[PDB]
Amino acid sequence: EGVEITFNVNDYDNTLTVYTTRPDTFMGCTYLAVAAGHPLAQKAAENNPELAAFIDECRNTKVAEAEMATMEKKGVDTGFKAVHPLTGEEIPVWAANFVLMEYGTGAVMAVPGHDQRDYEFASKYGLNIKPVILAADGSEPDLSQQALTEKGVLFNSGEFNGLDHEAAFNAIADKLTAMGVGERKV
């Protein structure tokens, strides 16, 4: 089971939609990443020559999902800001080479504290790494070297603090659904 989540973007006529099987980590989302070929990336390329160059480079490189663990991850800040719907804070939207258009929306929500691929991209570009899952012994996670991917009790997640994995999964999915910006997928 998973959740589709929709974000509004400042100064942009459309929304961004993301799919996640880890909605329990949602309060740790610190940026969004879109494919080189995403409409928002092309829109931003109009007033950004670095992005234009990045997009052309990605055009040549066909990256396969399964070969990505091995590939050099690359991205460019689009300068667009998405609003995190539960937090109300602006987060940057990056174009990245590892996000594809073929399967899915061409946009991902990044949680570098709790997703290893996200951790590596955020470390490389100096993006925020925000912890929202406690280590299994109940301590703050050690994020100094890598992401903590184990399901656990939430902290630093406002109203969802103290909830275990299944409770948090459901509570955040329900919150987003009631707000009209989330949809559970079978």
User: What domain range is 102 assigned to?
Assistant: 1-186
Residues 6+ apart with CB under 8 A from 134: 140, 141, 152, 153, 154, 155
Phi (first) and psi of residue 68, to 5 degrees: -75, -40
Structurally, the chain folds into a number of domains equal to: 1
Per-residue burial over 82-116, b if 16 or more Cβ lie within 10 Å, else e, is: bebbbeeeebbbbbbbbbbeeeebbbbbbbbbbbe
How far is C-alpha 102 from the geometric centre of its chain's CA atoms? 18
Q: What is the CATH number of the domain that holds 174?
A: 3.90.740.10
How far is C-alpha 112 from the geometric centre of its chain's CA atoms? 8
Method by which the model was determined: X-ray
Tokens of 20: 């996640």
3-state DSSP percent of the chain in helix, strand and coil, to 5: 30, 25, 45
Rounded CA-CA distance 174/79 in Å is 31
